[PDB]
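ok posting inputs for the G77 job
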Amino acid sequence: PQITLWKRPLVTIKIGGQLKEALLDTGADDTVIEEMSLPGRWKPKMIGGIGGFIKVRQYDQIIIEIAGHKAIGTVLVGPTPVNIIGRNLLTQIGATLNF
Amino acid sequence: PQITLWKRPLVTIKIGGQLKEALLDTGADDTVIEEMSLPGRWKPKMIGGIGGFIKVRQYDQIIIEIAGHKAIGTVLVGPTPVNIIGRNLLTQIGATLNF
Ligand SMILES: CC(C)CN(C[C@@H](O)[C@H](Cc1cc(F)cc(F)c1)NC(=O)O[C@@H]1C[C@H]2C[C@@H]3[C@@H](OC[C@@H]31)O2)S(=O)(=O)c1ccc2nc(NC3CC3)sc2c1
Ligand SMILES: [Cl-]
Ligand SMILES: [Cl-]
Ligand SMILES: [Cl-]
Ligand code: NA
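and the output
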C-alpha cells in the first residue's frame, strides 16, 4: 500500500497468535511492544526517547505479521506508551518513505 | 525521492534561518526541534514519548524547508534528544510510506 500521513499510520500486527494495533514508525530504530509474554530467553536493553529512557526485554527471532507481511526479528517488550514498529521490521516488509 | 530505512531517515532542514539535521518520523504527530529561538507568540505544551513527558514551546505558522520542500505549520521547541519532522509537516511535502 501507499499510506498517507494525515492520520497515524496504525496497522494490525499478529504476534503470539494475538492481534494488536501498532504504529509504523520511521523514527524508531527498533520495534517496541507493550507488556506481553513471548517465548525463549531475553537480554536487557535500555532505550531512549523523548522523555528519557526505559528498560525493555529484548527477544530475538520472533515471528510477527505486520499489515499482512511476515517478519521474523527482534522485538523489545516494555512499558512503551504505544506499540511501535521500527526500522528493523519496516525493512523486512519492504517499506520506504517517498515524496 | 525514495528513502530506504536501512539507516535513520535524516534530512537537512532550514528553520528560523538555521540549517539543522532532522529525522523524518512517521511515529511523531508533531514536529519537535531542539532549543532555539523563533519569532512570534508561543504557548506551553506537554508532549509524551518513550520515557515520559517534556515541556515544549508551541509556535504556530512557522515556515520550514525540509529536504528542499517548503512547508508551514506548528513547530514545538524543547529538550528533545533528536530533531524530528512529524506528520503535521510530512503531509505537506507529500510524504507517504510505501510497501
Ligand atoms: C523520538 C524518536 C527519535 C524515537 N522514538 C520514536 C518516535 O517516533 C516516537 C514514537 C512514539 C512514542 C511514544 F511513547 C508515544 C507516541 F505517540 C509515539 N514518537 C514520539 O515521541 O512522538 C511524540 C508523540 C506525541 C507527543 C509529541 C507529538 O509528536 C511527537 C511527540 O505527538 S521512540 O519511541 O523514543 C524510540 C523507538 C524505538 C527506539 N529504538 C531504539 N533503539 C536503540 C538503538 C537506539 S531507541 C528508540 C526510541
Ligand atoms: Cl531484527
Ligand atoms: Cl500544523
Ligand atoms: Cl495527500
Ligand atoms: Na506564530
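notes: DSSP finds one helix and nine strands in chain A. The first strand of chain A starts at residue 2 and ends at 3.
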